[PDB]
Amino acid sequence: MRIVPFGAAREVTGSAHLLLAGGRRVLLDCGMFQGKEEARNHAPFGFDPKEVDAVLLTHAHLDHVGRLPKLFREGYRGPVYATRATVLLMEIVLEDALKVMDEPFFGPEDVEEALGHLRPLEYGEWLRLGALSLAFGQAGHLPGSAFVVAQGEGRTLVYSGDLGNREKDVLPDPSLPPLADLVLAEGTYGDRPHRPYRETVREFLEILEKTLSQGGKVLIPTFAVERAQEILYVLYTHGHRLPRAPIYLDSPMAGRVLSLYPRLVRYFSEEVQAHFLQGKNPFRPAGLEVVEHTEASKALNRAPGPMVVLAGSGMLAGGRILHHLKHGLSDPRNALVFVGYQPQGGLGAEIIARPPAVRILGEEVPLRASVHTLGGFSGHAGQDELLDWLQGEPRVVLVHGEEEKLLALGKLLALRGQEVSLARFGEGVPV
C-alpha cells in the first residue's frame, strides 16, 4: 500500500492524495489550488484520471473538491463518495465556483458530470473495493466532514482530511483515529494552539456591545460555508445581551448555505441538535437579513450604524467586504473583527499591522476603526489539539500547512518518538 500526495505538500490548498493498494487506485479529495497558486488548476494532476477507481471527499470546501469537475473533464467516470451533507454543500460550492471563477479550468458539463456521480457514504459505513476496506471518521471541521480510514493488505492508513477545533460549539468533537501504520495529517496550525474559545466569545460580545451601543458598524470578513453561520449561532445564543441592530449576512452564497442547514441537523453538535429539537433554528438570530444584490450591499456603505455586517471574501481577496472596508475603516466608531485566519502578505495582515492608512480598491483609506483578530474562532485543530489527535501513532506524514508550521509540529512529533516527514508532491509513501 502507498499514498501519493498530489496537493497540499508544504501548502494549504490543492488537497488530493492517491491511494494505491490492491490493484485499486483511490483518490482522497480533489481540491483546487487557491490564491497565488490558482494557475496550477490548469496544470496536469500528475496522474491519469481515467485510471482512478473511486474518489472519497472529506468535506465540501473548494480546496478539497474544486478540481473534481476537472477530473471528470479529463475522462474519469467512476463514483465519488461523501457524506450527504458534503454532497449537498458541494452543489452550492461548485455552482458558485463555476460562476465567479476568473480563468475557468472546467465548464458546466463537467460540474454536472461530477455531481451526477456523487454517492452517499456516512460515518462508519464501510466501502469495499477489491481487497480494500474504507470508512469515514468524524472530523468535526464542517457539517459532514470526515477523515478516512483505509485498511488493506494487512496495513492501515488514516488520512485526516481537515480536523476541527473541538473547543467550539457548533460541530461535534473530532473522533480520535484508529491506531494506524501511517497517518497522513494536516498541520495547518502545527506551530501553536489557538486562544481559548470561551474567552474569544466573551471578547467578541464585548466588542459588539460597545460598537453597536455607540451607533457604529461591526464589520466581519467571513467565508460562506460555515464560519458565517457559526457567528450567527453565537449571535443567536448570546444576542440577548446586545443592543437591537440589524445583522446583514451580505453573501448570497452564505444565504444559500444557511437555508441548507435545517436539512443537515444530524451533522451538528449535540448542543445544536438539541436546539433544533426545541423547534427553532439556532442559526437565525433576531434581526437577521440576507442581502442578495449589489445595490443594497452598496447602500450599507453609506447607511449609518448600528449594524453587524458579515461579508466575503473571507481573506479580503475581493468581494463585497472590500467596499464595506473602503467606506467603514475611516470612522473610529466602527470595528473590524477578523474571525478567520489572514495569511501574511495579504490585506488583512496589512491592516492588522495597524498602519495609519491602507489602500483599498485604489484609494488610500485612513484606518481609524478599531481592529480585532479573534483567532479563537479557528476551524482547524490547534497545535495542542493536533498533538492529542496524533498521540500514539508511530508514523506521520504531514501535509496542508506552511513548511515552517509543519516543521514545528514535526519537531514535537519526532521528540515524542514518532516518525515524521513532510510530504513531497508526487512522491509515494509506503504504508
Known binding-site residue numbers for Zn(2+)? 59, 61, 63-64, 141, 162, 400
CA-to-CA distance for 164 and 72, rounded, in angstroms? Answer: 29
* Calpha distance 296→300 (Å, rounded): 7
Minimum separation from the CB atom of position 380 to Zn ion (A): 7
Segment interacting with Zn ion (CB under 5 A) among 160-168, 173-181, 235-243, 248-256: 160-168
Contacts of residue 134, Cβ cutoff 8 Å, sequence gap at least 6 = 26, 56, 126, 127, 148, 149, 150, 151
The span of 60-68, 221-229, 242-250, 384-392 binding Zn ion (CB under 5 A) equals: 60-68
Q: Which of 11, 29, 113, 162 binds Zn ion (CB under 5 A)?
A: 162
CB of 317 to Zn ion, least distance (A): 16
The residue of the chain with the least Cβ separation from Zn ion equals: 162
Q: What are the Cα distances from residue 23, in Å, to 54, 74, 117, 133, 270? A: 12, 21, 22, 13, 41
Nearer to Zn ion, 32 or 322 (CB): 32
CB of 408 to Zn ion, least distance (A): 18
- Which residue, 63 or 167, has its beta carbon nearer to Zn ion? 63
Residue 429's beta-bridge partner residues? 3
Encoded one letter per residue, x for contact with Zn ion by CB under 5 A and - for no contact, window 102-121 reads: --------------------
Q: Per CB under 5 A, does 63 bind Zn ion?
A: yes
Sole window of 106-114, 129-137, 161-169, 213-221 interacting with Zn ion (rule: CB under 5 A)? 161-169
Compute the least distance from the CB of residue 161 to Zn ion, in Å. Answer: 8
Closest C-alpha to 171, from 260, 112, 233, 245: 233
Q: Give least dist CB 359 to Zn ion, A.
A: 30
Alpha carbon 378 to its chain's center: 9
DSSP for 112-175, written as a single string: HHHHHTEEE--TTPPEEETTEEEEEEE--SSTT-EEEEEEETTEEEEE------TTSSSSPPPP
Query: Which part of the chain contacts Zn ion (CB under 5 A), choosing from 40-48, 57-65, 221-229, 238-246?
Result: 57-65
**Is 29 a residue that touches Zn ion (CB under 5 A)?**
no
In the bound state with Zn ion, the residue whose beta carbon lies nearer, of 90 and 307, is 90
Binding residue for Zn ion (CB under 5 A) from 10, 17, 25, 61?
Answer: 61
Point out the annotated binding site: 59, 61, 63-64, 141, 162, 400
Contact between 227 and Zn ion (CB under 5 A)? no
Taking each helix axis from N to C end, the angle separating 227-238 and 197-213, rounded to the nearest 10 degrees, works out to: 70
Using alpha carbons, list the distances in angstroms from residue 362 to 219, 303, 312, 365: 20, 22, 19, 9
Distances (CA, A) of 42 to 36, 37, 102, 395: 13, 10, 12, 33
Region 230-289 residues binding Zn ion, contact defined as CB under 5 A: none
Per the CB < 8 A criterion, the answer to whether 420 and 413 are in contact is yes
Are residues 27 and 18 in contact, defined by beta-carbon separation less than 8 angstroms?
Answer: yes
What is the closest distance, in whole angstroms, from the C-beta atom of residue 28 to Zn ion in the complex? 12
Residue 253 or 360: the one with the smaller Cβ distance to Zn ion is: 253
Burial of 397 by CB count in 10 Å (0-12 exposed, 13-18 middle, 19+ buried)? buried
Smallest distance from Zn ion to CB 27, Å: 16
Site of interaction with Zn ion (CB under 5 A): 61, 63, 162
